[PDB]
Amino acid sequence: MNGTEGPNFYVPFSNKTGVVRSPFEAPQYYLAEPWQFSMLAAYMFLLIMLGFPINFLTLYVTVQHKKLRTPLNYILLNLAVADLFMVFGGFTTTLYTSLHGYFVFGPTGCNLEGFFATLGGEIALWSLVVLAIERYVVVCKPMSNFRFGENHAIMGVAFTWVMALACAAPPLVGWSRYIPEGMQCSCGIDYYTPHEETNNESFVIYMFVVHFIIPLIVIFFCYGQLVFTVKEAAAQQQESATTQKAEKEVTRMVIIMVIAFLICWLPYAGVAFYIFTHQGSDFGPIFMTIPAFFAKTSAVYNPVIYIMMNKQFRNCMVTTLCCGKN
Ligand SMILES: *[C@@H]1O[C@H](CO)[C@@H](O[C@@H]2O[C@H](CO)[C@@H](O[C@@H]3O[C@H](CO)[C@@H](O)[C@H](O[C@H]4O[C@H](CO)[C@@H](O)[C@H](O)[C@@H]4O)[C@@H]3O)[C@H](O)[C@H]2NC(C)=O)[C@H](O)[C@H]1NC(C)=O
Ligand SMILES: CCCCCCCCO[C@@H]1O[C@H](CO)[C@@H](O)[C@H](O)[C@H]1O
Ligand SMILES: CCCCCCCCO[C@@H]1O[C@H](CO)[C@@H](O)[C@H](O)[C@H]1O
Ligand SMILES: CCCCCCCCO[C@@H]1O[C@H](CO)[C@@H](O)[C@H](O)[C@H]1O
Ligand SMILES: *C(=O)CCCCCCCCCCCCCCC
Ligand SMILES: *C(=O)CCCCCCCCCCCCCCC
User: Fold this and answer.
1) Which of 23, 33, 86, 254 is most buried when burial is the number of CB atoms within 10 A of its CB?
2) What's the CA angle centered on 59, arms 54 and 62, to 5 degrees?
3) How many independent structural domains does the chain possess?
């Protein structure tokens, strides 16, 4: 027996020596050394110090530069906002709790922190999906006489909001639940205890299919077709070096974006799928925080890839940071 059950939690540590306390009431220093809790805090600090400026600057630069405010870019603003939900909902609260050694805000705080942290990263997830769809629609022109504009861009943003709520809300009202995870300082969806009262098994399948496989297929399809269309168009215009450049640049960025998507969610899903097969095993507190490393860090590397590697934004950023010139 490798864990310790309670009303609103599951501490991954045997209580056979009697040392296990609630993650809402007392420090979990039997679960991990105090210095490891400090390193958790150190990492949350890094994610905030990098994550806030990068994502805030994205919104600020867009307000100052008319050229950035195009319908396509609406979703990349949505991304930046989602990343800020991850920072202020997730990382800051985890920084606070990690320094105590347990989730001080209790079960209600666990639901809040879990909701906004889940909502944040899920909006970001679907933002990356909707961008691929919009880019696919715009480049491949799969529809007869269609023009992407403000109305469509806003629907795409609302679509992410809805999908993210379809993921984050149900645990608040019966279907699965939010409980402290890993080192017990941050809360999230329960996918490591078969909890019949909330039906965790169905929700995990629903999550795996609707919120990972479907996104993964849409992203691979949309960008697959986009790279196909661009490559055959360049092959029919090989005299233009500009077009050959643009073709290679687009293919390079698609590979970066697809690989980046996998790094973010494949570890989180690979571990989730493993627990579905091998249930109730001796999963450490650190083991649970390894997938969350890659996922939470996306709040920094997504805006680096999807926004700061754009030459247009990069100029506006320099201008805004240098007060007007340069
Ligand atoms: C992990 O295991 C440990 C060990 O079992 C466990 O901690 C223990 O919890 C029990 C309560 O569940 C504690 O027992 C209490 O001891 C105090 C003595 O001061 C009593 O006052 C408590 O109440 C009794 O007496 C009252 C008298 O008026 C009655 O009103 C009441 O009904 C009770 O009879 C109670 O006996 C025990 O002290 C700890 N032990 C240790 C070592 O901490 C812990 O709960 C487990 N963790 C999890 C998450 O499940
Ligand atoms: C940068 C944000 C500030 C975080 C302040 C952390 C306060 C930690 O407070 C600690 O909690 C222990 C219980 O776990 C108690 O022994 C004491 O209150 C204190 O040592
Ligand atoms: C990915 C599909 C497999 C099942 C996933 C279920 C667990 C979801 O886990 C969630 O991930 C979010 C990442 O955005 C974190 O912010 C949340 O804290 C966490 O609850
Ligand atoms: C979703 C997957 C995105 C499309 C990835 C295609 C990358 C293939 O690679 C591309 O074409 C040639 C090989 O086919 C290489 O020699 C080129 O360097 C490269 O641009
Ligand atoms: C335009 O005039 C150029 C920008 C002016 C600012 C140049 C100085 C940048 C230094 C940033 C250092 C970051 C410190 C990070 C420590 C945590
Ligand atoms: C806007 O007008 C661009 C200039 C603004 C920067 C003024 C000079 C910056 C000096 C660099 C100091 C960096 C130290 C960071 C402290 C942690």
Assistant:
1) 23
2) 120
3) 1
Q: What is the number of the ligand 2 atom nearest to the C-alpha of 101?
A: 14
C-alpha–C-alpha distance, residues 59 and 78, integer Å: 9
Among the bound ligands, the one closest to the CA of 258:
4
224 lines ligand 4 (CB under 6 A): yes
Q: Report residue 115 CA to chain centroid gap.
A: 13
Q: What is the DSSP string of 50-97?
A: HHHHHHHHHHHHHHH-GGG--GGGHHHHHHHHHHHHIIIIIIHHHHHH
Method: X-ray
List the resolution, Å: 2.7
Ligand nearest to the CA of 26: 2
Whose C-alpha lies nearest to ligand 4, atom 16?
248
Q: How far apart are the first and last CA of the chain?
A: 63
Nearest residue (CA) to ligand 5, atom 3: 322
**What's the 179 CA to ligand 2 centre distance in angstroms?**
21
Q: In 3D, which of 40, 11, 2, 1 has the Cα closest to residue 180?
A: 11
CATH of the domain at 47: 1.20.1070.10
Residue range of the domain that includes 132: 1-326
